Design a protein around this nucleic acid. Structure first.
Lengths: 118, 233, 57, 199, 68
RNA sequence: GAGAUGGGCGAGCGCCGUUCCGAAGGGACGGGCGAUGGCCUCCGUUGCCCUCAGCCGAUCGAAAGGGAGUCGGGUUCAGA
RNA sequence: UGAGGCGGGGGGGCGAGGGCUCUCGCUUCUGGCGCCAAGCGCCCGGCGCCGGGCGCGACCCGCUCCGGGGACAGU
């Protein structure tokens, strides 16, 4: 052994893995953002109906803290219809509005009657 | 026989000719702060005039006799933690159906049996950090006529008694077969530590200049001795 | 083109087939070749003049 | 009852130096093995103009003697330097304009610039436009050396510390009068907020 | 025991031994940080006289104060 | 320009300072060894020993600076 | 300063007259290239073949990293 570098760097020491003797939390907190706390209600707007007839998209009032990914799979689970693209915004009053464009092999009207809105 | 493509290509390590190889640099390393301090505090023990009470631990016991000292003491180790409970089950049957001499560790127990002059040989360790814990001792074993010596290493001293370290170890009593085995150690030690006292009280360690300076005085001490050596002839 | 565009282009759009191509102009390459040969031969000419130095001294 | 102007200049934050476009620290090349024993060859890559500094700077490129890497220093251009010209640095370096070498090797009456005033401090003395220093006397013993300075005072400096031969470029900068306050406004704008001086 | 000696030894802070040992520590302590933990106490005599006992949980911090 | 750590100061809340009194890298390559996964093939995972490393100052700082890549037509009472 | 060749001691090379004192440890004509060992020696591991290690190359010895101050600045 000799010194080649004229400097002294600290050697790498064996840093173990965290192995606690007891979990700090006894219970894993359940996800409060499940599928039903993520879609509050659809829209019954004279514009949203125009959005349903023409563009084949549904309009929901989703929670303020949902990704487009999460909204896509939520609808995909609650109404069994595949989603082509989601567009979201935040209304001035505060709640987040979502335009769920359905897949073209699906119909927005006959699924709007599946959930009552017309 | 040999492939004539094998050609020796030297690298001319001149000034600015080729790049220097990875030569050893263990002399110019910017050491950490704790190592840098760890050494230049040892230079201070070879620079400043060390007073005789602290210098007297640089002089130590020689090796070949120290192997006898520990081996003699290796039977006089006190009973371990494991032998202690085994020495309390023997008493546990003698009710249900003398202690030999041992070593003495710890300064606060050794001095209490040096003032009573019970020891035969008090061994110390040269490398105790707050040296104040010892420095009185060699001047006091000499006073009350107890043969002392200085062994290099409180660690190997703290190996007899199973601890991390120990400062002093005393021989209160011994067995009869090792009685004369001790006597040959006492005389060889007393003739170097106890009777050699007045020389030790006036031995100031240190006052040494560095090898980069004693070579600098000498280069002017040989040059000055070059002039007056051919002036008369 | 702008620097990040260079990911899009292929290799041959970004360099020219020559030693030091795409980095050095050809004129300062033949100059570099002419140099790096003449300096070495000047080393060999002096290496046999130094060989004819201590043959005497 | 008020803190005068010359008192406010030490606090800074308005009188601080404007160093946004300054190129760098115009220094020498640090002391090492080659500089002490031999000489080291360097190319003058190009010559540049440092804002605020009346002298021009020079980008000298050396080949590092320990790692496969080219090192670049910013020198203070001695007058007469041109790009591509080789600069040699060290004790064994030859004596010709634009070359650093310790003063103890240079002879008497040599005209040097970018002089060091402590061995291994990368030049501090006589580094303004057109200012040189003369090495008057030597002293082999004690390694000392008398050097007159651009103010006229002679300083006894060690002989190990080095300097680059020649006068600093940009000399004669002060002959041309400033004609208008605009020119003087533009000069001090590149250096620091000091210029319009109320009596 | 020995603690009485070290006690009476530390009262001789102008003797050659102590004036050596104090000028070394004062150099050694000065080359450190202003607050760092000493492993074992510099004065085991004064320590126990102030309530220190060698047992797990007793800690000692050596610190320097800019005098004046 | 702002601002932590180290350090320094400070009765103190805290301040100074920004590379300067610092063991300041948790990475890459190659090699060796045991181990798993899918046709444990071959690759990937993983440890340890060995190997090389300049990094240079945490971080913040622009809806006019730097910054890859969308345009054309149609549509609304109000958005493109 | 990326704390990179410090002080010694041995070594060869250039001289006046085989030791000692001395110079030297290899680079100046040019806007080129330069790293991650060549080579030699001593061992070992895999069916003549394929894969490894230590050392010389790159001298040895040391106590402040080299320099400049310094019991004075300074506090």
């Amino acid at each position: 052994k000799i010194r080649t570098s004229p400097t002294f760097r600290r050697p790498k020491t064996l840093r173990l893995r965290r192995q606690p003797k007891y979990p700090r939390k006894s219970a894993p907190r359940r996800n409060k953002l499940d599928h039903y706390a993520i879609i509050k209600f659809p829209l019954t707007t004279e514009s949203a109906m125009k959005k349903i007839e023409d563009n084949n998209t549904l309009v929901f009032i989703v929670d303020v803290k949902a990704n487009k990914h999460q909204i896509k799979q939520a609808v995909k689970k609650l109404y069994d219809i595949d989603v082509a693209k989601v567009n979201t915004l935040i209304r001035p009053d505060g709640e987040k509005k979502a335009y769920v464009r359905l897949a073209p092999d699906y119909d927005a009207l006959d699924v709007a009657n599946k959930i009552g809105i017309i | 026989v040999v492939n004539p493509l094998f050609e020796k290509r030297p690298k001319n390590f001149g000034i600015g000719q080729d790049i220097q190889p990875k030569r050893d640099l263990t002399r110019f390393v910017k050491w950490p702060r704790y190592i840098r301090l760890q050494r230049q505090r040892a230079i201070l023990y070879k620079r400043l005039k060390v007073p005789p009470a602290i210098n007297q631990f640089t002089q130590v016991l020689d090796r070949q006799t120290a192997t006898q000292l520990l081996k003699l003491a290796h039977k006089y180790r006190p009973e371990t933690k494991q032998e202690k409970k085994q020495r309390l089950l023997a008493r546990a049957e003698k009710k249900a159906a003398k202690r030999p001499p041992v070593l003495r560790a710890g300064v606060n127990t050794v001095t209490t049996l040096v003032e009573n002059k019970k020891a035969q040989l008090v061994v110390i360790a040269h490398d105790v950090d707050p040296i104040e814990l010892v420095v009185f001792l060699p001047a006091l074993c000499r006073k009350m006529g107890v043969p002392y010596c200085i062994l290099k290493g409180k660690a190997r001293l703290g190996r007899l008694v199973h601890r991390k370290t120990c400062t002093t170890v005393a021989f209160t009593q011994v067995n009869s077969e090792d009685k004369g085995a001790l006597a040959k150690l006492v005389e060889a030690i007393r003739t170097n530590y106890n009777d050699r006292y007045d020389e030790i009280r006036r031995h100031w360690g240190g006052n040494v200049l560095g090898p980069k300076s004693v070579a600098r005085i000498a280069k002017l001490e040989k040059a000055k001795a070059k002039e007056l050596a051919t002036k008369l002839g | 083109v702008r620097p990040k565009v260079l990911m899009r282009l292929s290799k041959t759009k970004k360099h020219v087939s020559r030693a030091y191509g795409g980095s050095m102009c050809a004129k300062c390459v033949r100059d570099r070749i002419k140099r790096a040969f003449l300096i070495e031969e000047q080393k060999i000419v002096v290496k046999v003049l130094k060989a004819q130095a201590q043959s005497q001294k | 009852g008020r803190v005068i102007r010359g008192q406010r200049k030490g606090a800074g934050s308005v009188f601080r130096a404007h160093v946004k476009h300054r190129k760098g620290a115009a220094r020498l090349r640090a002391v090492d093995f080659a500089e002490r024993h031999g000489y080291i060859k360097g190319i003058v890559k190009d010559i540049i103009h440092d804002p605020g500094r009346g002298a021009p700077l020079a980008k000298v490129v050396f080949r590092d003697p320990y790692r496969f890497k080219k090192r670049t220093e910013l020198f203070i251009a001695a007058e007469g330097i041109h790009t591509g010209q080789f600069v040699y640095c060290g004790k064994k370096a030859q004596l010709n304009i634009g070359n650093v070498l310790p003063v103890g090797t240079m002879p008497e009456g040599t005209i040097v610039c970018c002089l060091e005033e402590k061995p291994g401090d990368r030049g501090k003395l006589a580094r303004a436009s057109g200012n040189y220093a003369t090495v008057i006397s030597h002293n082999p013993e004690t390694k000392k050396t008398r050097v007159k300075l651009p103010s006229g005072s002679k300083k006894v400096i060690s002989s190990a510390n080095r300097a680059v031969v020649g006068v600093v470029a940009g000399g004669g900068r002060i002959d041309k009068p400033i004609l208008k306050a605009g020119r003087a406004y533009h000069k001090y704008k590149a250096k620091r907020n000091c210029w319009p001086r109320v009596r | 025991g020995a603690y009485k000696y070290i006690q009476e030894l530390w009262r001789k802070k102008q003797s050659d031994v102590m004036r050596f040992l104090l000028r070394v520590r004062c150099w050694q302590y000065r080359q450190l940080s202003a607050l760092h933990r000493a492993p074992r106490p510099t004065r085991p005599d004064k320590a126990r006289r102030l309530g220190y006992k060698a047992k797990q949980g007793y800690v000692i911090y050596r610190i320097r104060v800019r005098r004046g």
